[PDB]
């Protein structure tokens, strides 16, 4: 339905994180069989990829930032659910050094 108002405390933020992750999982088979990909990728590893993406922003403290990040998460998920994203965009998107940089360019 409509956009949730806000989260006053971090407990509601964690609850919304869990709800978003659960919804993304319940939507994992439809995106498996709508893009016509069954054997190329198993549904298991997408769960780990989503978990890693969620855990990436672990240092966020502001509840509003958490809410807006979760909203962007639902937006991306809904875009993927519809046959709107380009073919195999998801699989490509969701998968000393000093000398190495020096031999290529000055800007590293």
């Amino acid at each position: 339905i409509g956009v949730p108002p806000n989260s006053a405390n971090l407990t509601e933020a964690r609850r919304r994180v869990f709800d978003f992750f659960r919804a993304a999982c319940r939507s994992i088979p439809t995106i498996m069989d709508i893009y016509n990909l069954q054997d190329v990728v198993a549904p298991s590893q997408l769960r780990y990829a989503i978990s890693a993406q969620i855990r990436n922003n672990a240092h966020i403290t502001d509840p509003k930032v958490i809410d807006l990040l979760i909203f962007k998460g639902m937006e991306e998920l809904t875009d993927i659910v519809d046959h709107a994203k380009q073919r195999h965009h998801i699989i490509g998107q969701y998968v000393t050094d000093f000398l190495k940089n020096f031999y290529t360019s000055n800007y590293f």
């Binding site: 922003n57 966020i60 403290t61 502001d62 930032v65 807006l68 990040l69 962007k72 800007y107």
Partner: protein, 119 residues
């Protein structure tokens, strides 16, 4: 520090670690008016600009080539610092140089030049 707004901005992550310079541009020497002072800008160092090998046009691959000049102007140093801090850029503030007004009088043109003492 505090790059949460940088995280939610949606811009490519590799551009969040750019080093930027914050300064107030000084008055040009070729003009005497001071109607272009007191405004602070963030200076992304868009150094890499090669030359197109068909017509000599200046090509570029840096998305921030002219952002800090054409747009994104701040009315104060604090606003620019807060902006760069919010977007998680490694800023480096450069304080501007201000002219020092000195007592200048027209009569100083015409001095007694002392007394013709032997020397």
């Amino acid at each position: 520090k505090r790059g949460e707004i940088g995280k939610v901005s949606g811009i490519p992550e590799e551009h969040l670690s750019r080093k930027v310079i914050i300064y107030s541009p000084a008055r040009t020497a070729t003009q005497s008016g001071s109607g272009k002072l007191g405004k602070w800008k963030i200076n992304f160092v868009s150094t890499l600009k090669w030359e197109n090998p068909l017509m000599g046009w200046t090509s570029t691959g840096d998305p921030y080539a002219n952002v800090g000049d054409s747009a994104l102007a701040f009315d104060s140093e604090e606003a620019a610092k807060s902006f760069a801090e919010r977007h998680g850029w490694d800023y480096k503030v450069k304080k501007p140089n201000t002219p020092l007004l000195k007592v200048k009088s027209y009569s100083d043109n015409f001095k007694w030049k002392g007394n013709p003492q032997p020397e």
